[PDB]
Design a protein around this nucleic acid. Sequence first.
RNA 1: AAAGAA
Length: 93
Amino acid sequence: HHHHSQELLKDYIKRQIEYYFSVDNLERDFFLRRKMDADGFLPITLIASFHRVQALTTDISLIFAALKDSKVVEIVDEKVRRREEPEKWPLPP
RNA sequence: AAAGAA
């Protein structure tokens, strides 16, 4: 027993989601950007369906917990966006 | 290139 399994899992979830919201990924992620609203937000439940997140967990409240203190993303209601200049990224649906 | 990290 060398770590708390659910805390480690939360760190994997957080870093996987922060990757999607990195500038490097966003520059090329046309699917993700077409799903943004005009303010840059995506449903957290959409992110939950992405294959690597769903592989790590199907517990939605755990994904919220994993993201609670992220400096990369901001959460409003059940939606999430890049904290820095989110409005640059949406693309037409 | 099956979501080859939507």
